[PDB]
């Protein structure tokens, strides 16, 4: 039985899509199928922000940010709980969680 209309990927009007390597296990996975997340977080964790600011060597300074694009295979994405198994009706929802 077929469970997804898109077959678990995002390929339309296309023959082949080159793969990426899973950021967790290194497994090959088509890019249109890999679960991709973009993480933008402060280099200094919120706990240490005050201590680092108190030790600033300049009158003013804005702490940088860390940018990471994570590309997971299906297995790692499920195991890491990046995505979860949804009900038959709920897995047709494509909007990101609020």
């Amino acid at each position: 039985t077929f469970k997804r209309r898109n077959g678990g990927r995002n390929k339309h009007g296309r023959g082949h899509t080159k793969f990426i390597r899973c950021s967790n296990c290194g497994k090959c996975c088509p890019k249109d199928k890999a679960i991709k997340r973009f993480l933008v977080r402060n280099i200094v964790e919120q706990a240490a922000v005050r201590d680092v600011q108190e030790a600033c060597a300049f009158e003013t300074y804005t702490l940088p940010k860390l940018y990471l694009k994570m590309q997971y295979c299906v297995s790692c994405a499920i195991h890491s709980k990046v995505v979860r198994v949804r009900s038959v009706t709920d897995r047709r929802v494509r909007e990101p969680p609020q």
Partner: protein, 132 residues
């Protein structure tokens, strides 16, 4: 060197991997090493070399040693393993940075210098990845 409040800046190259932590301090050019304390020099078990506590101890030792060499402030160069491997810093990065901040050292510029390929050689593990 002239005034007590004058700031002498070094560069702290922090290599926080998932197996170890490095706290390497050099001059501005980077050609001269001041102190290099790793997390594996502060623990007994190989599994604790990258722990936050080992990073904190290494950072405390680094700050203590640098204070004797006339270094007041440090620039931060945080990196992960990079290459085709993980770009996420190890658990010891934040602990080392906090310990350096809390040890009386002034913090300068903070930069992420993880080596990022515009495109890389093949990553290890085969096309099926690490199977566990």
């Amino acid at each position: 060197a002239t005034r007590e409040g004058e700031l002498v800046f070094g560069v702290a190259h922090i290599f926080a991997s998932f197996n170890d932590t490095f706290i390497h301090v050099t001059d501005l050019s980077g050609r001269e090493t001041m102190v290099r304390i790793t997390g594996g020099m502060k623990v007994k078990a190989d599994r604790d070399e990258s722990s936050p506590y080992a990073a904190m101890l290494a950072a405390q030792d680094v700050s203590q040693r640098c204070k004797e060499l006339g270094i007041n402030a440090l620039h931060i160069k945080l990196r992960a393993t990079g290459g085709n491997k993980t770009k996420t810093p190890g658990p010891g990065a934040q602990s080392a940075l906090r310990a350096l901040a809390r040890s009386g050292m002034k913090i300068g510029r903070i930069e992420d210098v993880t080596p990022i390929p515009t495109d890389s050689t093949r990553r290890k593990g085969g096309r099926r990845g690490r199977r566990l």
